[PDB]
Amino acid sequence: IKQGIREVILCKDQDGKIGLRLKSIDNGIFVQLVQANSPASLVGLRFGDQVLQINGENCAGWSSDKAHKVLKQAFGEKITMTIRDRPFERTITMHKDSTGHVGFIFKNGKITSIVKDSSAARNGLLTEHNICEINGQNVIGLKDSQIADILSTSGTVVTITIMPAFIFEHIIKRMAPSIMKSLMDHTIPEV
Ligand SMILES: CN(C)C(=O)Cn1cccn1
């Protein structure tokens, strides 16, 4: 979560796709989903990102349907976006015990309990929060077992990006879980 407003240059793929769905929240526009192997994924758009501008047009107060339209109407040699990095999210760092726990319970992405004397307790992890990312990798739409697998398989250090469930549930609505599971980019970023 960066306290900054970066700029990205997109470029439509061969099919006129950039691999993005946007959702209106509280009179801004925010990334609802990012397709793997897309211009959006390569330029490093993330779920949760705020789109402040598109081609120097402010997005204040747009509907979703309009932001999608805007993206169609555009000469895709170069589309230029202004992005505030995941405004609604925060990142916690944790360390595992000898027994390879960080110390919480979660369900459907949502942390539901913190365990006394855990690193999760020491670090102030909160319940009623949807897990968005682990060590920089989006996990949204995965199943809990797979998130466990990423956590079980992560180093001694774990890093989680969380979002308040109320806000999370309001972003993902109007989107069917299988799309989230199949299409939402869940890859380590390329370099
Ligand atoms: C932005 N929306 C809802 C649409 O563009 C729908 N559409 C119909 C034909 C081409 N696009």
Side-chain angles (χ1 to χ4, degrees), residues 123-135:
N123 273 271
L125 187 72
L126 303 190
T127 63
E128 202 60 6
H129 276 85
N130 270 277
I131 300 164
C132 286
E133 294 176 9
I134 297 163
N135 295 291

PDB file of all heavy atoms in Angstrom, residues 123-135:
ATOM      1  N   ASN A 123       0.803  -8.469  15.967  1.00  0.00           N
ATOM      2  CA  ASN A 123       0.848  -7.509  14.867  1.00  0.00           C
ATOM      3  C   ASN A 123      -0.484  -6.798  14.668  1.00  0.00           C
ATOM      4  O   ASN A 123      -0.550  -5.816  13.936  1.00  0.00           O
ATOM      5  CB  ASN A 123       1.376  -8.126  13.568  1.00  0.00           C
ATOM      6  CG  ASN A 123       2.885  -8.044  13.546  1.00  0.00           C
ATOM      7  OD1 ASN A 123       3.442  -7.049  13.082  1.00  0.00           O
ATOM      8  ND2 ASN A 123       3.536  -9.016  14.159  1.00  0.00           N
ATOM      9  N   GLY A 124      -1.533  -7.242  15.360  1.00  0.00           N
ATOM     10  CA  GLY A 124      -2.778  -6.507  15.330  1.00  0.00           C
ATOM     11  C   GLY A 124      -3.571  -6.882  14.096  1.00  0.00           C
ATOM     12  O   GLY A 124      -4.147  -6.029  13.412  1.00  0.00           O
ATOM     13  N   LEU A 125      -3.625  -8.180  13.816  1.00  0.00           N
ATOM     14  CA  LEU A 125      -4.459  -8.591  12.700  1.00  0.00           C
ATOM     15  C   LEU A 125      -5.898  -8.552  13.186  1.00  0.00           C
ATOM     16  O   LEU A 125      -6.116  -8.768  14.360  1.00  0.00           O
ATOM     17  CB  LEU A 125      -4.038  -9.977  12.217  1.00  0.00           C
ATOM     18  CG  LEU A 125      -4.721 -10.479  10.949  1.00  0.00           C
ATOM     19  CD1 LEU A 125      -4.228  -9.736   9.715  1.00  0.00           C
ATOM     20  CD2 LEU A 125      -4.492 -11.978  10.804  1.00  0.00           C
ATOM     21  N   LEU A 126      -6.838  -8.254  12.281  1.00  0.00           N
ATOM     22  CA  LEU A 126      -8.215  -7.996  12.636  1.00  0.00           C
ATOM     23  C   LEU A 126      -9.122  -9.006  11.948  1.00  0.00           C
ATOM     24  O   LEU A 126      -8.892  -9.361  10.789  1.00  0.00           O
ATOM     25  CB  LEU A 126      -8.598  -6.588  12.155  1.00  0.00           C
ATOM     26  CG  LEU A 126      -7.739  -5.429  12.666  1.00  0.00           C
ATOM     27  CD1 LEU A 126      -8.371  -4.100  12.324  1.00  0.00           C
ATOM     28  CD2 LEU A 126      -7.485  -5.521  14.171  1.00  0.00           C
ATOM     29  N   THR A 127     -10.219  -9.342  12.633  1.00  0.00           N
ATOM     30  CA  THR A 127     -11.255 -10.177  12.069  1.00  0.00           C
ATOM     31  C   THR A 127     -12.157  -9.334  11.177  1.00  0.00           C
ATOM     32  O   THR A 127     -11.925  -8.145  10.996  1.00  0.00           O
ATOM     33  CB  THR A 127     -12.023 -10.872  13.195  1.00  0.00           C
ATOM     34  OG1 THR A 127     -12.672  -9.869  13.982  1.00  0.00           O
ATOM     35  CG2 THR A 127     -11.105 -11.687  14.074  1.00  0.00           C
ATOM     36  N   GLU A 128     -13.176  -9.971  10.602  1.00  0.00           N
ATOM     37  CA  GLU A 128     -14.029  -9.297   9.654  1.00  0.00           C
ATOM     38  C   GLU A 128     -13.173  -8.585   8.602  1.00  0.00           C
ATOM     39  O   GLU A 128     -13.450  -7.456   8.234  1.00  0.00           O
ATOM     40  CB  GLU A 128     -14.952  -8.377  10.457  1.00  0.00           C
ATOM     41  CG  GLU A 128     -16.241  -8.005   9.728  1.00  0.00           C
ATOM     42  CD  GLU A 128     -17.130  -9.178   9.337  1.00  0.00           C
ATOM     43  OE1 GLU A 128     -16.795 -10.330   9.740  1.00  0.00           O
ATOM     44  OE2 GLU A 128     -18.161  -8.942   8.624  1.00  0.00           O
ATOM     45  N   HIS A 129     -12.127  -9.254   8.101  1.00  0.00           N
ATOM     46  CA  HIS A 129     -11.317  -8.742   7.000  1.00  0.00           C
ATOM     47  C   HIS A 129     -11.102  -9.834   5.937  1.00  0.00           C
ATOM     48  O   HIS A 129     -10.747 -10.975   6.238  1.00  0.00           O
ATOM     49  CB  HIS A 129      -9.998  -8.167   7.545  1.00  0.00           C
ATOM     50  CG  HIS A 129     -10.084  -6.756   8.042  1.00  0.00           C
ATOM     51  ND1 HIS A 129     -10.485  -6.406   9.314  1.00  0.00           N
ATOM     52  CD2 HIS A 129      -9.778  -5.599   7.430  1.00  0.00           C
ATOM     53  CE1 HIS A 129     -10.451  -5.085   9.446  1.00  0.00           C
ATOM     54  NE2 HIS A 129     -10.027  -4.573   8.318  1.00  0.00           N
ATOM     55  N   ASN A 130     -11.302  -9.489   4.666  1.00  0.00           N
ATOM     56  CA  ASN A 130     -11.032 -10.428   3.588  1.00  0.00           C
ATOM     57  C   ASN A 130      -9.561 -10.362   3.190  1.00  0.00           C
ATOM     58  O   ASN A 130      -9.020  -9.278   2.938  1.00  0.00           O
ATOM     59  CB  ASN A 130     -11.971 -10.192   2.412  1.00  0.00           C
ATOM     60  CG  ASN A 130     -13.234 -11.005   2.553  1.00  0.00           C
ATOM     61  OD1 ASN A 130     -13.261 -12.188   2.206  1.00  0.00           O
ATOM     62  ND2 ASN A 130     -14.274 -10.381   3.068  1.00  0.00           N
ATOM     63  N   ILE A 131      -8.912 -11.532   3.186  1.00  0.00           N
ATOM     64  CA  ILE A 131      -7.557 -11.677   2.664  1.00  0.00           C
ATOM     65  C   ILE A 131      -7.580 -11.424   1.158  1.00  0.00           C
ATOM     66  O   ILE A 131      -8.318 -12.109   0.464  1.00  0.00           O
ATOM     67  CB  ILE A 131      -6.999 -13.090   2.928  1.00  0.00           C
ATOM     68  CG1 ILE A 131      -6.925 -13.428   4.417  1.00  0.00           C
ATOM     69  CG2 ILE A 131      -5.632 -13.234   2.273  1.00  0.00           C
ATOM     70  CD1 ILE A 131      -6.754 -14.897   4.693  1.00  0.00           C
ATOM     71  N   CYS A 132      -6.756 -10.468   0.697  1.00  0.00           N
ATOM     72  CA  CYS A 132      -6.643 -10.086  -0.703  1.00  0.00           C
ATOM     73  C   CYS A 132      -5.378 -10.657  -1.338  1.00  0.00           C
ATOM     74  O   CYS A 132      -5.413 -11.159  -2.453  1.00  0.00           O
ATOM     75  CB  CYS A 132      -6.647  -8.573  -0.859  1.00  0.00           C
ATOM     76  SG  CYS A 132      -8.300  -7.873  -0.615  1.00  0.00           S
ATOM     77  N   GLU A 133      -4.256 -10.547  -0.635  1.00  0.00           N
ATOM     78  CA  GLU A 133      -2.966 -10.925  -1.183  1.00  0.00           C
ATOM     79  C   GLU A 133      -2.133 -11.597  -0.084  1.00  0.00           C
ATOM     80  O   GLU A 133      -2.344 -11.347   1.101  1.00  0.00           O
ATOM     81  CB  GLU A 133      -2.247  -9.694  -1.748  1.00  0.00           C
ATOM     82  CG  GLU A 133      -2.894  -9.017  -2.963  1.00  0.00           C
ATOM     83  CD  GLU A 133      -2.163  -7.747  -3.398  1.00  0.00           C
ATOM     84  OE1 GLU A 133      -1.060  -7.475  -2.877  1.00  0.00           O
ATOM     85  OE2 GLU A 133      -2.679  -7.013  -4.245  1.00  0.00           O
ATOM     86  N   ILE A 134      -1.226 -12.502  -0.493  1.00  0.00           N
ATOM     87  CA  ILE A 134      -0.195 -13.066   0.368  1.00  0.00           C
ATOM     88  C   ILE A 134       1.152 -12.921  -0.326  1.00  0.00           C
ATOM     89  O   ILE A 134       1.309 -13.310  -1.472  1.00  0.00           O
ATOM     90  CB  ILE A 134      -0.479 -14.540   0.696  1.00  0.00           C
ATOM     91  CG1 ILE A 134      -1.781 -14.714   1.474  1.00  0.00           C
ATOM     92  CG2 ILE A 134       0.688 -15.150   1.452  1.00  0.00           C
ATOM     93  CD1 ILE A 134      -2.300 -16.128   1.464  1.00  0.00           C
ATOM     94  N   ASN A 135       2.131 -12.343   0.357  1.00  0.00           N
ATOM     95  CA  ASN A 135       3.430 -12.131  -0.253  1.00  0.00           C
ATOM     96  C   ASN A 135       3.229 -11.668  -1.690  1.00  0.00           C
ATOM     97  O   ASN A 135       3.804 -12.237  -2.604  1.00  0.00           O
ATOM     98  CB  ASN A 135       4.293 -13.399  -0.214  1.00  0.00           C
ATOM     99  CG  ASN A 135       4.663 -13.850   1.186  1.00  0.00           C
ATOM    100  OD1 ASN A 135       5.441 -13.202   1.889  1.00  0.00           O
ATOM    101  ND2 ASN A 135       4.122 -14.985   1.594  1.00  0.00           N
TER     102      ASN A 135
END
